[PDB]
Amino acid sequence: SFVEMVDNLRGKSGQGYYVEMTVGSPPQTLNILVDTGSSNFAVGAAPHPFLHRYYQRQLSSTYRDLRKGVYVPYTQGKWEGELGTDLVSIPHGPNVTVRANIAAITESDKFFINGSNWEGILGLAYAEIARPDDSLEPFFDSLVKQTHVPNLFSLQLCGGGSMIIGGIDHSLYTGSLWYTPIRREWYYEVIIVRVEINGQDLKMDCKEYNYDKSIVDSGTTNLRLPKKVFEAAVKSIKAASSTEKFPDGFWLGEQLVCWQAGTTPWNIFPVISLYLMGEVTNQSFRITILPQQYLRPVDDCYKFAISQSSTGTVMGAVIMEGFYVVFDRARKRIGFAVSACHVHDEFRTAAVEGPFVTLDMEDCGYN
Numbered sequence: 001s002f003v004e005m006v007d008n009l010r011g012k013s014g015q016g017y018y019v020e021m022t023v024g025s026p027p028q029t030l031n032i033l034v035d036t037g038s039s040n041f042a043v044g045a046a047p048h049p050f051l052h053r054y055y056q057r058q059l060s061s062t063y064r065d066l067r068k069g070v071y072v073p074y075t076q077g078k079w080e081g082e083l084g085t086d087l088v089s090i091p092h093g094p095n096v097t098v099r100a101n102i103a104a105i106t107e108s109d110k111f112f113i114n115g116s117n118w119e120g121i122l123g124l125a126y127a128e129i130a131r132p133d134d135s136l137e138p139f140f141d142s143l144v145k146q147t148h149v150p151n152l153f154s155l156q157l158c159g160g161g162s163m164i165i166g167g168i169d170h171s172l173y174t175g176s177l178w179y180t181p182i183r184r185e186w187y188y189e190v191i192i193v194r195v196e197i198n199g200q201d202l203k204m205d206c207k208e209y210n211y212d213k214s215i216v217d218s219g220t221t222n223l224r225l226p227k228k229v230f231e232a233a234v235k236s237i238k239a240a241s242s243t244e245k246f247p248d249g250f251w252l253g254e255q256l257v258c259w260q261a262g263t264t265p266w267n268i269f270p271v272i273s274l275y276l277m278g279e280v281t282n283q284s285f286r287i288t289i290l291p292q293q294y295l296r297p298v299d300d301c302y303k304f305a306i307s308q309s310s311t312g313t314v315m316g317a318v319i320m321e322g323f324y325v326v327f328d329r330a331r332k333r334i335g336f337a338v339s340a341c342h343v344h345d346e347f348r349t350a351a352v353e354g355p356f357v358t359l360d361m362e363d364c365g366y367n
Ligand SMILES: CN(C)C(=O)c1cc2cc(c1)C(=O)N[C@H]([C@@H](O)CO)Cc1cccc(c1)OCCCCO2
Pocket: 013, 014, 015, 016, 033, 035, 036, 037, 038, 073, 074, 075, 076, 077, 111, 112, 113, 217, 218, 219, 220, 221, 222, 224
């Protein structure tokens, strides 16, 4: 029954991917950012310069006030609001209606994005990081509890896309799905066991790759890397592309770089392979990222979409684009496969490949 959910996402890596939802009775239609990096469902509920519409609780006969406030900070932006519950549906999702927790956003700071076309956020991660605490049941938990929707979803982000709620649509990917364990149910936390650039091992202690966590986050644009890993990767990418020279602010994500339309020198930029812990003992697999993913288009002009982090690795939208990503909550694992909407180079291709042998993978997790 998944064909109804194919292509139910709109947006881009830079401003977020959103799905259409309705809240309340009669249904009020809103576009909702798909965020695997948080766990609160929240919607604009007061006028705002960047909102073209918002949730009006006074117009919904099924609205219930919870008489409790809430604030949620993100890496970029934050909001505060008032908690309640209401009936929620996804028109291009499963044919169900659930009563879900909803934060009515009344004040916000650098959260809504001008011209993004979304008015709320769907946090798909686990209750452990929900605000104000883990007793506020996340949307997907309510969906699974109240309906027969299986406890998994998958995301095909195309650099539009698809959020398949309750399963896997095999027409959306090619080759094999490779699975990595969800290390802990809070963020979608994973363990990176090896990193190669153009086939050259970065040869860092693999704990550095996951310091202090590594997560899969559809709501972050960039591949974000811990400082030490970021410095090693930039040095290697600079070396591979030293044919040309770029402003020092290009590598910080500030300045864009442009080339005569159709002459982008893709071949001077390396591929990046991230090896992830596998399902069996001493087994990993790799996903390979092309420069067409980490040079985000904005002549042909691009921003460098690899940036530094102090809260661990973030596999953001530019990594997820071109892969089909299965958030298999029931089996505590995340699957990767080459997406049907994959990145096209002429001599290189994004890939998900295995198996690989990797010893001592448990040592790669940070404590
Ligand atoms: C340095 N720096 C600011 C970043 O690296 C960055 C970039 C980014 C989003 C976040 C962080 C962010 O905080 N993302 C949030 C959660 O996933 C993680 O906490 C979700 C969120 C919150 C507000 C607006 C959003 C997404 O817009 C989506 C468009 C893409 C914006 O790209």
